[PDB]
Symmetry: C3
Subunit: 125 residues, 3 copies
């Protein structure tokens, strides 16, 4: 099934995936942020998504931002039934401030397949 | 396609999942920990788990603890055959200490589906 | 349901997985690196890989390095069609430098199953 989304404001950008077999859709900041050194920011995308059945959506790092600028992505687990505004929690572990501009790609969204098991307690395994 | 667990001591709390389609089961600390700024702790759950076949268990961040308190989860890959005490490695990148009380939810456990491929070397792909 | 790889230099070490049900294959450094406290390094494996169809390759942390040495892995999303040198972005959040010696295992490679959905914009969910 498809990944669907809707744009919660005009500042949102539709996620894109250039390559057919790329693991994730690019997520774009809907706003300017300045993240000082050793600080975190929630970067809003102003999109809502409806994930396909049988996965969650992992908000995962973009490789170049980590290797060049020491940016990481925190949190990241979007439940299959989440319909709120997707926020990317960015961590700037670098020594200088990191600027996000509206329309910058700042993370990717991977549809990771998972089980939804029932849980059972036993005395010992 | 059940997740089974056992309590290794009476300090453990059975993992829970509120929504049927949340990605993960909440893991609870069995102990109090104080994590100073820019430090790590291994927080013990005092549970052992038996993951379903075809996945590993990812210990992943709770979204709120990351966006509000700059808490991140390190390590996180529990192999399908692991039967030891589940430990959550918490990183506090905040400027203030972070208190874990016994019984606090500190991470979530996601059953992520994976392959177990054989490996082969070639001269060049 | 083969993972295929090729060595790009003679400094590369073939990835290994000791347990049949371990989530990932060990990745080994091709070089010596010294990572200062609160810094990062891109550790080259000098291998290229060809992932099985239906997954991407997560470069994930080794549990012991995170809980003992405060090492974490950045980036980590290797697309199914990536044929370049696999680099591991290591973050040293410890107060002491961390030494990587050529031949050390520095991360694991997990074949995470994923969907590759088409994307559809709707006016609202
Ligand atoms: O990385 C993630 C992980 C989960 N989710 C979905 C849950 C987001 S949230 O439901 O949990 N949420 C939306 C409104 C408030 C809160 C929040 O935006 C937030 C911002 C600031 C302080 C506390 C919470 C948020 C956003 C992104 C990640 C985590 C929390 C994301 O969007 N991104
Ligand atoms: O996040 C993870 C990832 C893997 N595992 C399973 C393997 C845990 S462990 O086998 O690898 N382990 C138990 C004995 C020592 C070690 C440890 O508790 C540890 C604590 C402190 C210093 C060194 C090792 C541990 C626990 C949790 C994560 C990583 C290490 C977890 O529980 N949590
Ligand atoms: O963890 C990852 C995530 C993705 N990839 C594949 C893309 C690697 S890369 O194509 O994107 N790459 C190869 C040459 C330059 C770049 C790089 O080696 C790099 C090193 C130093 C600065 C900037 C980029 C790299 C390697 C690993 C992760 C991120 C960048 C990895 O190997 N490791
Ligand atoms: Mg506006
Ligand atoms: Mg995953």
């Amino acid at each position: 099934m498809q990944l669907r989304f809707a744009r919660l404001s005009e500042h949102a950008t539709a996620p894109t995936r250039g390559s057919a077999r790329a693991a994730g859709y690019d997520l774009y900041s809907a706003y300017d942020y300045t993240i000082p050194p050793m600080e975190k920011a929630v970067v809003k995308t102003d999109i809502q998504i409806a994930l396909p059945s049988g996965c969650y959506g992992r908000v995962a790092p973009r490789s170049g931002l980590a290797a060049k600028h020491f940016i990481d992505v925190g949190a990241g687990v979007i439940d299959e039934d989440y319909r709120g505004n997707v926020g990317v929690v960015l961590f700037n572990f670098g020594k200088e401030k990191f600027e996000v501009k509206k329309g910058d790609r700042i993370a990717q969204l991977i549809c990771e397949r998972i089980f939804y098991p029932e849980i059972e307690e036993v005395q010992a395994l």
